[PDB]
Scaffold this motif. Structure first.
Motif, short mmCIF file in Angstrom:
data_model
loop_
_atom_site.label_atom_id
_atom_site.label_comp_id
_atom_site.label_asym_id
_atom_site.label_seq_id
_atom_site.Cartn_x
_atom_site.Cartn_y
_atom_site.Cartn_z
N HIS A 182 0.82 -1.20 0.00
CA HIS A 182 0.00 0.00 0.00
C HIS A 182 0.87 1.26 0.00
N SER A 183 0.41 2.30 -0.67
CA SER A 183 1.07 3.60 -0.65
C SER A 183 0.28 4.59 0.19
N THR A 184 0.97 5.52 0.84
CA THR A 184 0.33 6.69 1.42
C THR A 184 -0.10 7.72 0.34
N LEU A 223 -7.47 11.16 -3.43
CA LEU A 223 -7.40 11.71 -2.09
C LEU A 223 -6.61 13.01 -2.17
N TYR A 241 -12.99 8.11 4.06
CA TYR A 241 -12.05 8.34 2.96
C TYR A 241 -12.66 9.30 1.91
N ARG A 260 -12.83 12.69 3.56
CA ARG A 260 -11.49 13.24 3.78
C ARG A 260 -10.92 13.87 2.51
N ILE A 274 -4.75 8.54 8.50
CA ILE A 274 -4.02 7.76 7.48
C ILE A 274 -3.70 6.33 7.97
N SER A 320 -6.83 4.26 8.27
CA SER A 320 -7.35 4.01 6.93
C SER A 320 -6.58 2.92 6.18
N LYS A 340 -7.96 -1.62 6.07
CA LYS A 340 -8.06 -2.39 4.82
C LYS A 340 -7.13 -3.60 4.80
C1 TDR Z 1 -3.32 8.49 2.66
C2 TDR Z 1 -4.08 7.18 2.42
C3 TDR Z 1 -3.72 6.31 1.39
N1 TDR Z 1 -4.40 5.18 1.21
C4 TDR Z 1 -5.43 4.86 2.01
O1 TDR Z 1 -6.11 3.71 1.81
N2 TDR Z 1 -5.81 5.67 3.01
C5 TDR Z 1 -5.16 6.81 3.21
O2 TDR Z 1 -5.57 7.59 4.22
#
Ligand code: TDR
Ligand code: TDR
Lengths: 446, 446
Positions: free
Chosen positions: B83-85, B115, B166, B169, B181, B184, B188
């Motif tokens: 996963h990436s931020t 996002l 999400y 946000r 973050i 979130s 998942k």
């Molecule tokens: C920054 C961010 C990236 N990816 C996510 O699923 N949630 C988040 O809050």
């Protein structure tokens, strides 16, 4: 700037431009601003604040988000209004609007619903079957022609942006914001085309400002911004060691308001109606002094003319003529019958001998809110029969086991925590019995 | 407590209990929390923060707001995810999910939409006609059985509370919150039942937190909370001031992802796919070292097997089999034809001689967002053909008037401000030409 960037600016403690503020207000009106964007903006403003210029532009944007009210030239001097920042059991407006009409004034009152733990005039009036708070600019002409007064809410034509934000503020912990309150109150009064405005700013817990100086800053802001926007405004700073009168709720407060218009009711309620009414009549140039004005308002309470005007207003705004007449000319017991009643009643008794020093308004507001007299979400219907009646006066000596509060509830019980919260509202002492002090009311003048 | 009370607590900088957080999350899921209340809570959290315990409980509540995914026992060790931020032009996931499937892994990726100014994998996939991001827990079993991978979005069964928050946000300036973050991302990944997780956190201009210290802290929080919740997590902190690869947008990023699965494309994109894939294979015990894993991933990019897995995933998730095959086996020019194209193109030219020192990611993201690649409100459709292509490398010497950026736009023409904002993204210097540096990649462990 789209919505997300505007929120981000305020979130960071940045100043919003005139263009920014008007853009946000526009987006609120047309539906572009989604709920979450309204709540986030409101909270950003609540936590990061606004300067006077921002507050002033917000007031103008909210006022201009709907129509401006225009009235016959002959009415220009007669147009007056009163507004409250909020106070538990404050039903001055129910009495004062028709009383001022009886004194030859015009009162085009755009009011509000509940807000946090404080009830709103509009919700109180809706306990009267058929009363319609939504009234067009042209219908408002008819009402002022018929009764000399009206009490209406924000709508698509009238300050729609305040309506949206107010409803959201109620339920998002963003009520207690100086710029938001200023803009909210003033926008409504600005569109009414008034010759004079009085704003009653109360302090002491229950209130939006538990402190006199805090409330003083709000009073000075309301008057200062008001004046800069072309409106003749005075504020009254008010405090109490109890809720106003004996009744807190909706149907109950209509009932007490009717008592006052009978020439009766509790002295504090009458004192505040006459004090604020007389201030207004003086401010608009209809009375030589505040004391002359107050006597004029008192006379209207005593000769049935305020009550007469109120009946006309009720019928003009959707109440069945037969019910409006039956309500106004009826006895206290007949009125209770015509208005919503809670299914259940319980009385709280005095735990010991003592003089009532104080009945704390805040714990009473909070418990009644949870019983259905307030909202946890916007658009949520209220239980209009729910409320409480004070059965004792402040300064009164009472015996243990004597009922001091009657609670009207729709459920089977007060929870322990709410039963305890109400008990701690009653403050007793060893002191000698004394006369119930009449509300503090200092003026902040233009 | 009720929501306005919950919001008020956080507004005042108070700590929310486990019960409070779970109550708020529950209200979000069942609809009881209205939009304005979600926005206000999110902004309260954004401005006032949360401690580690609050963050952890919020992660658990979001995970537990839908179903937990259960898989055959034989898959337990194969289950991995990345996963990436966020990162402008980061399409690693489009490539890495199928590449890992080709390396004998299972990748049950729950991802997200856009996002703020950063695009989301789910929006990129939707430029592929018929691709369905909403897939039930049992459908996900079928996908993992057919392609070894899937990329899905939050839904009513999967982390519904994250989906709601999400989406809010994105458009309320509440994206850049450490606790939001962490909760979130981790919620998942927690429901997928993984043996190993890598989270790619960047710093520099292309990132959510361009400040390195903010990003390191976020990386350590993700790993620390992850581990405490039973998950084997590593973070990769990667500096990145420019977009990854040459394509920023949606259709355009699918196109570049397909180039990488062709064994081609830009080196920085491939370097990050192999670096992060190999980290993961090492972390899950499928490779002896990260370098052995990266060679494994690179091989899958080179022999067509990642591309093969991607084609299976597309068809399994709703893409017409004939289109999926035509897209994957097609030339770059054929792919452009099959995916949405912006109506108009314009190229920005180099203002002088110079070596490209840098192409600033942020000004590019902000302008593309305004052209339809981003949202100003939740549920707003995107213009999936909109985007930009870098026509030069960092480190490349270029002549004046040589095109450095191609903008794909649907509207009229670039304005003065957005045209100027894009031009300032290009940084030129007198320096000697140099090789494009490959992504910084520092691995954070528990
Ligand atoms: C920054 C961010 C990236 N990816 C996510 O699923 N949630 C988040 O809050
Ligand atoms: C506090 C308050 C009272 N009355 C209003 O009309 N608005 C407000 O914001």
């Amino acid at each position: 700037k789209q919505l997300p960037e505007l929120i981000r600016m305020k979130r960071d403690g940045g100043r919003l431009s005139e263009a920014d503020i008007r853009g946000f207000v526009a987006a609120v009106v047309n539906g572009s601003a989604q709920g979450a964007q309204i709540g986030a903006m409101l909270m950003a403003i609540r936590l990061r604040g606004m300067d006077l210029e921002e507050t002033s532009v917000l007031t103008q944007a909210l006022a201009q988000s709907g129509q401006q009210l225009e009235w016959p030239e002959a009415w220009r001097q007669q147009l007056v209004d009163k507004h409250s920042t909020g106070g538990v059991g404050d039903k001055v407006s129910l009495v004062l609007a028709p009383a001022l009409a009886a004194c030859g004034c015009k009162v085009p009152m755009i009011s509000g619903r509940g807000l946090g733990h404080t009830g709103g005039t509009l919700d109180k009036l809706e306990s009267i079957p058929g009363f319609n708070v939504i009234q067009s600019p042209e219908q408002m002409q008819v009402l002022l022609d018929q009764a000399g007064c009206c009490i209406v809410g924000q709508s698509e034509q009238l300050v729609p942006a305040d309506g949206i934000l107010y409803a959201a503020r109620d339920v998002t912990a963003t009520v207690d914001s100086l710029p938001l309150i200023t803009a909210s109150i003033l926008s409504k009064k600005l569109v009414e085309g008034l010759s004079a405005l009085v704003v009653d700013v109360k302090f002491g817990a229950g209130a939006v400002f538990p402190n006199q100086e805090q409330a003083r800053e709000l009073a000075k802001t309301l008057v200062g911004v008001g004046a800069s926007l072309g409106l003749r405004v005075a504020a009254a700073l008010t405090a109490m060691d109890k809720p106003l009168g004996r009744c807190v709720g909706h149907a109950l407060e209509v009932e007490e308001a009717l008592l006052c218009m009978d020439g009766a009711g509790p002295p504090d309620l009458r004192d505040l109606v006459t004090t604020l009414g007389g201030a207004l009549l003086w401010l608009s140039g209809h009375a030589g002094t505040q004391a002359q004005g107050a006597a004029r308002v008192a006379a209207a309470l005593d000769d049935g003319s305020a009550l007469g005007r109120f009946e006309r207003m009720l019928a003009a705004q959707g109440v069945d003529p037969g019910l409006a007449r039956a309500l106004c000319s009826g006895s206290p017991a007949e009125r209770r019958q015509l208005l919503p009643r809670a299914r259940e009643q319980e009385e709280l008794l005095a735990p010991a001998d003592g003089t009532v020093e104080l009945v704390r308004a805040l714990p009473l507001a909070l418990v009644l809110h949870e019983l259905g007299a307030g909202r946890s979400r916007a658009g949520e219907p209220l239980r209009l029969g729910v409320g409480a009646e004070l059965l004792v006066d402040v300064g009164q000596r009472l015996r243990r086991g004597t009922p001091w509060l009657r609670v009207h509830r729709d459920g089977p019980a007060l929870s322990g925590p709410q039963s305890r919260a109400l008990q701690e509202a009653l403050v007793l002492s060893d002191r000698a019995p004394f006369a119930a002090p009449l509300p503090f009311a200092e003026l902040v003048l233009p």
